[PDB]
């Protein structure tokens, strides 16, 4: 909190992280045990910020009992009286969104251009799921017969979330405002490579007025991550990150039957005709595939062109990647900062590696980069790739490589673009660029994927909900269909009269 | 159907069912290969009615195969078009009810009484999700500076159901129903003890004007129940059944991350305040434990009564318990039946011998029972049971019994009431009978349970959403919460004028 | 009856009508008192086929009590009860579909090719709101200190509709369903035009199972309608006529504080781009302008046409309606048949005049006709007109003429046409041609009407609501909507402790 | 702005208004013409405050057009852009909550107790439309044959409310909210007897940041009133007020075909059972009779007691009604303050005149009323009125008295009262004491009226919806309900294929 009263006077290789990170019962908690701990690192730099000391059992424990404690209280205010605790914490995230951003963009690499969105992106959040709050309700139906039924729309209990390091303050807050909302409470996990903007959101509820206890943050790895799956008194999960971990959890979930919500990775097709307004498309296909550091889970990373266009839009799109400054991402000039960490950096360049030994064609980057800039010497930096000459039936066009790497192939017809693109397990998200006004519907309508985005990319609106198909997982978040993963209906049927009886 | 077309002229221990029992691509299978197969009896004789034939994993395939082609054409049918042929279908079975109902009953075992009021829910449940048919829809919303969002509420695909043998045809219905009115194509799995009426359904479907191969069924136990968790191609998987079944479900669901509802067993709590008025309560007890010979998922097997009216409640309660009449279920006034099979029958009487060994007192029943018919003497009967001097530790008073055995325990105040009855990892269902206004909500409030029934037991209206908390599952079915179980919402997100770019 | 059994025989220039035409207490009345009649006619030849005997003050009280009687039963029973009855009306309009479309021709004079699809319209309107009467649903919210509220979705008692005589049956149908569904009682006002086929509808939903009186008609002209405004015992009105009426229905209920809702007429716009698709530019504006001889609320009768493409359009639609036959209306090979009446025919033949005086170059069309078959030489035809040269000062370019007379117009630019559309204070449905995506909804939104048509012209889907915007009128019919303007919430607020008073 | 400011040192007695209190344009308009004026009085002591200077025709036109420009912004600005305005606006009225509440009650003359609860509500209903206005939204439906039709829900316009004098802050408010969060501007004008605090909300919305012009404030009587009936370009009229009046503004509206709701006054009924909690019942009667002096819409002013507890309802009722403390509104413990006008409180006196003339018996109260302090000598006083041996028959009990005057009936059963309590023309809200839960709900079914309240009275909750059934008037404010009486359906049909035609 005084780190990020700070913030204004801070830079690129300046900061050193010395708070306790893991935090309930209202309060960060001392370390102790002696527990092997493990680097958190400055993605510009290479610089350690501080150790990260993962919870045990024992711990874990003490998170939940805090979190229920707060549960007891919090679910018996209405809507209304959560609602106005809610709108304040909002108010202070406001308050303070330029300071939150510079320590988001320390610990996680992004740009503050990016970073300044998801900030703002975090407090409406909040505020819509306020705003939603007083209008949460069952329904009153009348029965043949003089008999009514009515549910209750009630809370879950306390809820986990385990969360991913490309987006930690903003994924922190869409799983706790919907939760919130719904009269629950919440332990959440950060990744343990990032794990520090976390424990800001929680005490800023804490400032804002959340009964003790409400937002608890539990550090720490996998078996962390299991202990939560595993307890006996957590209601539910919501997890984010990969296909084969979110396996695992819904399985380590089926042992105490608990609520699951997957939002796993994705391997997005855009898809891109010849009537479209090519400039519009070369922007949609670098915002599909290049915001931080290329690391997001709906990126349109399999780009498809009809075969006519082809030649200028790799024209314009190459020129376009080569021009992104990789640099200080605390610069506002800046446009790409370090990949998250150094075994991530090695993978995406494995990727490319194995992509030109498969065939491809490199147009540009796929390379490790060092800026000119000597403080960023050991930063995970490599200069955005562009690949071509790709196949269906190659490693970078099936498998998610999450970097800076977009995929071109092209196509000649919809029939022919549709089969290739539904042609995966994934299904998160995808996207269309045409100007006749059927195709850009009916081809939305094909596509076999959770959002669709007609004419541009990667838009992120609160006011509609956002998950996956198939292999990509199930659940949503934002929008109005999401409080019905935070809260479940009880069906009371009242006889008016004298009992129906068979006996 | 030549068999059901039989019935009218058929009795207790007369038939016999020769038809073969797979069914896809709209035609009945002759099983062949001479896999092992499993008798099938008639519970009020003992008599074998048929062999059933388990599919493996070619036929399997081919039954979802067949349920794939035929969702590439209903998927494409708008609500107004699949409507107007499930209307059908429920006129169909509207007019063969009593036929239905009397096989039903030969499989089963329960009585014609309880059998026309299954049949009767089974073509209103088809009703009503036909009725919700052409009222599916998504959103419209408008978005910060001139964008807009659209969401489709989609189906899913292919749906795998595995049924119970308590209720075999309504049971069918009540996954049949909402997943065809969603769009989507449907392979389940009966019970391999009542195969036979399911096949029934299936047919009337087809005659009603389904795409052919819409509806197919799969017999067989287990193993055939983990193909079909396993097949890549299934999108959904809904259960019905017990705790330990449903847990490993959901673990061989998460390896293709597939969409899961379950509804597992009970041990529902039904309080019984001293200002109820007696007579109803009577009634509401009876009614919660013994519809159906004891083998119902919502019964209030766990009778809490206040501590003054005990002796009275009890004394009635006996009574009428003993005059129940056992014996030929296709008698109008028989109220009781054979159990489904032996081992059931032999379980819920050891259930009743190891109650008597840690303490508890038999006040009726509890016992093998040989009805006078001679036609009966081979049938799974046994009299139905009241249990008294019961404690909360005992085995029968935490387990679910799934026979005609009511446990009584007196009890002294609303708060103690109210923790004995939540000290569970079950949760159903539950119920209360009390006069006072406030008295009602608030211990209906307080009971963690899908379901509270007020001065009443054991209704089902089709209007209303009916499934577990806790460890009884989740998902629902009935009401119109229950669409969202069997279709997706995919977000559109349209941009109107130029691209914002970073790039 | 016994006419509608009879149709199969029957041809132009051959039916009379006998029976009584006043229908309340689920009976025919016998006319009485020699009030004035009025006589009613066969468009396509002029023949008179009874005389219309009009309702007084008694008549419409009768009509009313009869209504208020089977209101307190019909509002008794429960959705899944009313709806099971509607569908059961609906099935009968089906089996006599054929018989009830020719009939509504020979009154009405519209072709049997579009009669058929009206009557579908009816009977499909009636499966729609059957469908929904089981979901009609309040809220159940928790309030804050314990407290919570419900809400009661409740009828409102006897509604009144005010017919048209343009689509008859239909129109009857569209207002006794959603009244029906929702649990009212009905008396209907056909036009004194049209009142035959009104009352086969009231005796369907009798012999589907309807508590008696529950569907009444009263025939007559503005008196009889003033009397229904006037009645203290209806609670609402519904109008379907013009601007000049639909106001002093509004004045007249206005004195017992009834629910209104109004669909008054048009002078609705259609716009085609340079962009578009020709020739289904050119079926959306005949489809905009000559259905049911022009004489349709929602016709495009001002068609606006992109300066470059206009020639080319006028050619073709010229072409197009002079090809149009106009002759008998039970032939399926015409697509006009005669006007409503003698004094409509001269009042559009009247505009057509007037327009010559004011400028405007008559294309085609425009004057009577005398069709070759000499049974027909007496009925109401003219030939189907199209204008040109026209100004928005215009008197045909600014009122609604209700028939078969379009204003063609060119423009420049679509800020341009997008103010001469909306400079009216009609406002009811509009159109657009185009191709580009945005331009397609961005002039959809820009428009002021109730409907837009993106496109194409002139779809009905039950599916979504209908109705105007501006002067007109207000309400809507069809749609989830339309259940609120025939239903009422209350709110019951419950009090869970003691109560907080100041006194 | 600077007389609210001033307000922690003002005291009864001590304040003038000098301030222009016509407003649009985002500022205060000075008075000219010398329009005949009006005083505006202090009810606790009879000064003068300020005189109210009337708006004619040209006045009214420019609010209209100042309120039509502001909208062509509002109306582009999505739901989270309005939301955030609304937001800060309702922030700005919580932080002068204090003051504004003092200058309430200087001008009405209820009492800071019950002011404190009104300008708490109006800042919680603009905070609650907020959170309304980003999950605002129409539907997406999937139509027969790839087609697909979408409904934009959009603002109506220029909305213009007609206020009553009773609470003055808050329906001002009550209406600005939906109206603003739904995209419409607005023109509203006070009762000319409470002129003052209505443009202090209109200047904090703007220093919240409204588009300049947004909400204006015209003062005036009925002439005033009737202008902005009458005007061509206000799309809508919402009025409070009397029943009489309401009919007046319906058919001025009529000429306009005007969006209009009504909320009229009422004549509600209290059912007190012998079953009920005595003192909860006392409580209920007397919140239901004596806040704001009597001057409440919804007080049940007929209360009606079973016969057996009559005698000690009367006893305890007439006690609490004599201690009820009659004085200076800004102090604490007063607990009723002026009546609103000396014409009112001489109307209220002439009512209690006539009904002892006409046999009813004064329990208490019912008289002219001078206090102690000397500043209150010519203030509008009265003490708080019991009446006793009432009929149904009698003036008092079938007019809106709108003072405090309660009239007590007795009653034998529950069909009786049902009946004695419905049989009027008025049906705003209603009450029910008993512990039974079926009666209670029962009767709360039974009763005809918009409200029923429960074991409590006079609860006002922002989360759900408020309006009358029958001659109370119709429409709604509160709740998600009234978000359609502020907002409209556009529905827009895209054919996705070519044009099916008959031409």
Request: no cysteine; proline share 12%; net charge positive.
């Given at each position: 909190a005084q780190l990020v009263d700070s913030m204004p006077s801070a830079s690129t290789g300046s900061v050193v992280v010395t708070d306790d990170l893991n935090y309930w019962g209202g309060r960060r908690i001392k370390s102790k045990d002696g527990a092997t701990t493990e680097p958190v690192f400055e993605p510009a730099t290479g610089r350690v910020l501080c150790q990260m000391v993962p919870c045990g059992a024992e711990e874990v424990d003490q998170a939940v009992q805090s979190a229920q404690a707060a549960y007891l209280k919090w679910s018996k205010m209405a809507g209304i009286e959560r609602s106005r605790v809610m709108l304040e914490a909002a108010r202070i995230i406001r308050e303070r969104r330029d300071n939150i951003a510079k320590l988001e963009v320390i610990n996680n690499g992004k740009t503050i251009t990016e970073a300044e969105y998801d900030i703002d992106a975090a407090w409406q959040c909040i505020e819509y799921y306020a705003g939603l709050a007083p209008t949460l309700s069952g329904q009153h139906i009348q029965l043949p017969g003089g008999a009514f039924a009515y549910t209750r729309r009630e809370p879950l209990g306390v809820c986990a979330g385990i969360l991913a390091w490309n987006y930690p303050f903003m994924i922190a807050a869409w799983k706790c405002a919907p939760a919130l909302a719904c009269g629950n409470a919440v332990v959440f996990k950060p990744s343990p490579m990032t794990p520090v903007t976390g424990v800001i959101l929680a005490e800023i509820f804490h400032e804002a007025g959340v009964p003790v206890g409400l937002v608890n943050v539990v550090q720490g790895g996998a078996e962390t991550g299991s202990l939560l799956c595993h307890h006996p008194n957590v209601a539910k999960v919501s997890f984010t990150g990969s296909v084969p971990t979110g396996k695992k959890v819904m399985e380590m979930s089926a042992k105490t039957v608990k609520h699951v919500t997957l939002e796993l990775g994705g391997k997005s097709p855009l898809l891109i005709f010849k009537d479209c307004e090519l400039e519009n498309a070369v922007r949609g296909a670098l915002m599909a595939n290049f915001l931080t550091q290329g690391q997001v889970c709906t990126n349109g990373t399999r780009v498809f062109v009809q075969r006519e266009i082809m030649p200028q839009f790799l024209e314009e799109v190459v020129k376009r990647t080569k021009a992104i400054v990789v640099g200080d991402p605390l610069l506002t000039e800046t446009r790409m900062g370090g990949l998250i960490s150094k075994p991530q950096l090695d993978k995406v360049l494995g990727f490319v590696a194995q992509a030109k030994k498969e065939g491809a064609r490199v147009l540009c980057g796929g390379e490790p980069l060092t800026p000119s800039?000597?403080?960023?010497?050991?930063?995970?930096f490599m200069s955005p790739c562009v690949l071509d000459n790709c196949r269906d039936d190659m490693t970078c066009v099936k498998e998610e490589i999450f970097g800076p790497v977009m995929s071109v192939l092209p196509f000649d017809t919809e029939e022919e673009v549709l089969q290739r693109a539904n042609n995966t397990t994934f299904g998160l998200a995808s996207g269309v660029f045409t100007r006749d006004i059927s195709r850009a519907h009916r081809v939305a309508a094909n596509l076999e994927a959770g959002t669709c985005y007609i004419n541009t990319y990667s838009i992120s609106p609160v006011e509609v909900p956002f998950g996956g198909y198939k292999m990509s997982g199930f659940g949503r978040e934002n929008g109005q269909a999401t409080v019905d993963y935070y809260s479940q209906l009880k069906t009371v049927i009242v006889e008016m009269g004298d009992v129906d009886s068979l006996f």
């Open positions: 800039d000597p403080k960023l010497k050991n930063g995970y």
